[PDB]
């Protein structure tokens with residue numbers, strides 16, 4: 001409808017795939033080459049389905065901060081025959097708050113879904129499903145089951161991936177440029 005949705009659509013159309021694990025179907029953001037991200041609670045194994053194609057996982061790393069606290073981001077390298085458009089220059093270099101963000105989801109349950117979530121708070125610490133988690137972004141939208149892995153954008157920046165909600169608020173794990181050097 002506006003330039004927020006324009007940027008979100010450009011990321012969804014070229015940099016997302018549908019990832020299926022034994023824990024469900026997720027929006028999965030491709031960042032560069034064969035490297036993508038997914039919430040750690042997806043429990044990625046040796047094999048994953050990418051757009052319903054059986055795919056070997058060449059490497060997977062559950063990120064933690066230097067306090068050894070969960071970040072809820074897993075970086076995956078896929079045995080895929082095609083590279084992602086390199087979007088690393090759209091990743092923030094620091095923790096920050098944002099105005100006017102969009103949460104974008106693409107699965108069998110939620111095809112071509114775009115949610116204007118509004119202001120995003122650097123929330124920091126969250127007990128997420130009982131796991132202490134750092135670098136959490138918060139938005140005041142009642143997100144639902146099936147939106148995990150959804151991409152959080154502003155105009156010109158890809159700032160996080162949706163990892164949970166409490167029925168009134170939604171929470172994303174930050175994406176930082178330093179994760180993908």
Ligand SMILES: O=C1CC(I)=CC=N1
Pocket residue numbers: 141142143144
């Ligand atoms: O919070 C929500 C999500 C959705 I999809 C529909 C209605 N409310």
